[PDB]
Ligand code: NA
Ligand code: NA
């Protein structure tokens with residue numbers, strides 16, 4: 001209601017990358033979102049051997065980017081203010097290797113030109129998905145390259161796909177952790193386009209607009225999911241240590257076509273990222289490594305007439321698109 | 332430090348091949364000279380590809396060590412940037428060279444028998460220099476080169492000069508005709524039980540300056556036989572009402588490692604102080620044309636005696652600032 005997807009407790013000491021001839025698989029997930037956003041392509045690939053994967057947002061023209069990183073365990077490479085691709089992956093910090101696969105592939109496509117203005121810029125972020133499985137396989141260069149090679153315009157594989165293969169929510173106790181997925185949502189308003197992509201691996205739980213906990217912290221003894229604050233407040237009431245496992249974060253992107261200055265884009269990124277504490281609770285905690293990329297293709301000038309009404313209004317809309325994406329990941 | 336007055340002009344950059352065009356064998360970098368130091372628990376390895384030429388330098392601290400990162404300028408190239416690290420990987424190849432850190436990470440995971448508990452994660456922070464203007468290939472530090480640098484790590488040794496990440500580092504990017512090859516550099520001091528190690532790979536837009544204020548590496552004008560401070564070029568452009576010129580692809584990546592226990596707040600303040608101090612030896616510094624990144628690392632081994640603001644961090648910062656200037660001068664020598 002929704003049915004549980006308990007991850008079960010991890011088994012450590014399983015086989016790693018060296019044990020397999022790892023075969024990239026194109027991730028299709030549970031269903032395909034289709035959208036109209038020329039110049040923005042998405043690819044997703046996984047290793048069944050994990051299972052673990054990578055999701056690549058490819059913007060071949062390059063696009064201005066703001067990064068908003070929060071919590072105590074961020075796993076980020078590049079974090080550039082201009083990107084040709086964003087690579088999201090499992091495997092904790094080891095999975096940043098997938099982004100090197102994307103960077104090297106883009107250098108090849110550029111016929112190995114290395115002038116400073118031709119540098120192919122990939123920002124990468126990762127989730128700790130080793131809790132959700134019993135292997136040590138992680139996204140490697142080959143998997144990042146595969147995700148890029150599978151990238152097509154206007155498609156996103158919802159659910160257990162790419163970086164979302166082994167994403168999970170609700171880390172108060174691993175016995176109550178549930179598999180999430182990745183999610184995406186898209187809106188067009190006049191000529192304005194907003195795409196949200198998210199891979200929620202939070203310490204917290206996914207919450208819908210009614211306040212219902214819909215994924216994470218499921219107790220098989222009760223058949224019910226609980227907001228973590230109730231666990232935490234009873235630990236403090238009982239004067240016992242609260243418990244929670246490390247290895248959490250949400251990694252996300254907003255892509256829009258609206259021209260924004262560097263200041264507007266950074267403020268927009270912060271607003272949208274804070275808004276995600278509506279659908280993920282708690283969020284931005286010391287136990288999380290939350291990283292949001294806000295990307296603009298700089299195509300549309302909004303009509304007007306030092307503080308940006310347009311960034312605030314766009315931020316409010318983009319916040320709703322992102323909440324929709326979080327709910328798709330949890331579905 | 333007897334800096335060689337002779338010029339080492341890089342020359343103008345050149346359609347060259349990339350990594351898989353070559354059968355790349357890592358070479359253990361020995362540089363011009365070995366620094367020997369006494370700091371158990373800290374090892375340095377340096378590897379290069381002749382075909383670049385380009386390389387990587389890895390500082391390996393297997394215990395793990397608390398770290399503060401201080402990043403400045405408009406072109407920083409960083410991976411991880413963790414507050415706790417088992418290794419720091421410094422490399423050429425611009426952002427492509429961040430791959431070398433993935434090689435270090437994967438090797439450390441193999442050494443840990445593929446254990447993946449959160450507390451057992453092997454944490455590598457990586458930073459890069461743009462060294463493509465100093466050569467004629469697209470070769471960059473890859474996983475194999477990072478792994479090789481880690482495998483070459485020797486306790487208590489550092490190869491000075493054109494070695495590891497320093498192989499194609501360069502200074503003075505007002506005009507590529509006046510750019511000179513630098514190198515990497517290290518210096519070490521022991522004071523009572525305090526140990527301070529500085530490592531630097533200067534690829535600055537600016538020039539290396541000695542304690543007398545002499546420009547000793549970068550911005551060498553072969554028409555005059557002397558190096559001058561970039562400010563002279565910039566002020567002449569503005570006085571002439573013509574655009575100043577300067578090439579992109581600059582930064583200095585560095586580490587300061589000490590055994591003195593510091594809180595996260597002290598360590599971050601220490602990092603900022605030491606990094607700012609490097610504007611003495613590198614000028615200009617922390618510019619929008621640079622991607623300057625300093626890692627300040629404590630191995631948390633000794634408590635300094637005491638008598639909300641840290642005198643110990645300030646005093647240690649002053650001494651570490653001198654060790655780092657010495658390291659910059661060894662890179663430029
Ligand atoms: Na797509
Ligand atoms: Na050493």
Ligand code: NA
Pocket residue numbers: 394395396629630631632
């Ligand atoms: Na220690």
